[PDB]
Design a protein around this ligand. Structure first.
Ligand SMILES: *[C@@H]1O[C@H](CO)[C@@H](O[C@@H]2O[C@H](CO)[C@@H](O)[C@H](O)[C@H]2NC(C)=O)[C@H](O)[C@H]1NC(C)=O
Ligand SMILES: *[C@@H]1O[C@H](CO)[C@@H](O[C@@H]2O[C@H](CO)[C@@H](O)[C@H](O)[C@H]2NC(C)=O)[C@H](O)[C@H]1NC(C)=O
Ligand SMILES: *[C@@H]1O[C@H](CO)[C@@H](O[C@@H]2O[C@H](CO)[C@@H](O)[C@H](O)[C@H]2NC(C)=O)[C@H](O)[C@H]1NC(C)=O
Ligand SMILES: *[C@@H]1O[C@H](CO)[C@@H](O[C@@H]2O[C@H](CO)[C@@H](O)[C@H](O)[C@H]2NC(C)=O)[C@H](O)[C@H]1NC(C)=O
Ligand SMILES: *[C@@H]1O[C@H](CO)[C@@H](O)[C@H](O)[C@H]1NC(C)=O
Lengths: 49, 109
C-alpha cells in the first residue's frame, strides 16, 4: 500500500489476531504454543510433498 | 477493503466516466508518507499488571512512552482509558516498565 514499514513479527501476528476478532493478549500469552503449532504445520506440508 | 481492487493505497472513493465502448474509473486512495522509526513494545508492566493498547501501538521517542494510532503518528500519554489490563507481567516476551496514569485519583487530590 506504499513503502515497506518494519514491525516485529509477533506484533504483526497480534494485529492479525485482532483482524479476526480475538484480543491480542491471547496471542502474547500463547506465543510459544502458537509458534510450535505453525512450525509443525509447515513441517507437515513438505512431508506430504 | 479488498486490496488493489480499486487502485494502489487505501481506497477512499471512486468516480466513473464513460468512454467509447468502455468505462474509466478514477480511484482516489490514501497513501502514507514520511515515516519515522521508533522503539516499540507489546505490553507495559505497572503494579504487577500487563497493559495492552486498546487501539494503537506503544512507541518510544527515546526516553518517553506513548500510544499512537497505527497509521498516522499522533502520540498520547498512556492512561487507563488508553489501555486494558490482562494478567501479570511475567508471561509476555518483551514487556517494558512504565507508569500508567489514572485520571480519577489526581482529580480527587
Ligand atoms: C490447547 O491445545 C494444545 C494442543 O495443540 C495443548 O498443548 C498440548 O498439550 C499436550 C497435553 O496433552 C502436550 O503434550 C503437548 O505438548 C502440547 N502441545 C504444544 C504444542 O505445546 C494445550 O494444552 C491446550 N490448552 C488448553 C488450555 O487446553
Ligand atoms: C520525547 O518527548 C518528550 C515530550 O513529552 C520530551 O520531553 C520533555 O518532557 C517535558 C515533560 O514531559 C516537557 O515539558 C518538555 O517540553 C519535553 N521536551 C523537552 C525538549 O523538554 C523529550 O525531550 C522527547 N525525547 C526525545 C529524545 O525526543
Ligand atoms: C531482541 O534480540 C536481541 C538480540 O539481538 C536480544 O538481546 C539479548 O537479550 C538477552 C536477554 O534475553 C541478553 O542476554 C543478550 O546479551 C542480548 N543480546 C544483545 C546483542 O543485546 C533482545 O532481548 C531481543 N528482544 C526481545 C524482546 O526478545
Ligand atoms: C521492571 O520492574 C519490575 C518491578 O520491580 C522489575 O522486577 C524486579 O526485577 C529484579 C531483577 O530482575 C528483581 O531482583 C526484583 O525482585 C523484581 N521486583 C519485583 C517486585 O518482582 C523488573 O526487573 C523491571 N524490568 C527491568 C527490565 O528492569
Ligand atoms: C530507520 O532506521 C534504519 C536503521 O536502523 C534506517 O535504515 C532507516 O532508513 C530509518 N528510517 C527512518 C524513517 O528513519
Amino acid at each position: 500500500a506504499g513503502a515497506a514499514l518494519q514491525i516485529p513479527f509477533a506484533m504483526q501476528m497480534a494485529y492479525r489476531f485482532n483482524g479476526i476478532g480475538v484480543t491480542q493478549n491471547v496471542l502474547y500469552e500463547n506465543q510459544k504454543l502458537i509458534a510450535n503449532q505453525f512450525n509443525s504445520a509447515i513441517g507437515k506440508i513438505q512431508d506430504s510433498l | 477493503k479488498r486490496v488493489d481492487f480499486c487502485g494502489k493505497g487505501y481506497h477512499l472513493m471512486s468516480f466513473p466516466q464513460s468512454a467509447p465502448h468502455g468505462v474509466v474509473f478514477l480511484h482516489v486512495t490514501y497513501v502514507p508518507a514520511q515515516e519515522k522509526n521508533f522503539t516499540t513494545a507489546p505490553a507495559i508492566c505497572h503494579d504487577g499488571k500487563a497493559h495492552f493498547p486498546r487501539e494503537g501501538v506503544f512507541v518510544s521517542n527515546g526516553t518517553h512512552w506513548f500510544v499512537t494510532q497505527r497509521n498516522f503518528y499522533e502520540p498520547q500519554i498512556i492512561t487507563t482509558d488508553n489501555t486494558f489490563v490482562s494478567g501479570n507481567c511475567d508471561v509476555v516476551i518483551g514487556i517494558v516498565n512504565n507508569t500508567v496514569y489514572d485520571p480519577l485519583q489526581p482529580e480527587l487530590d
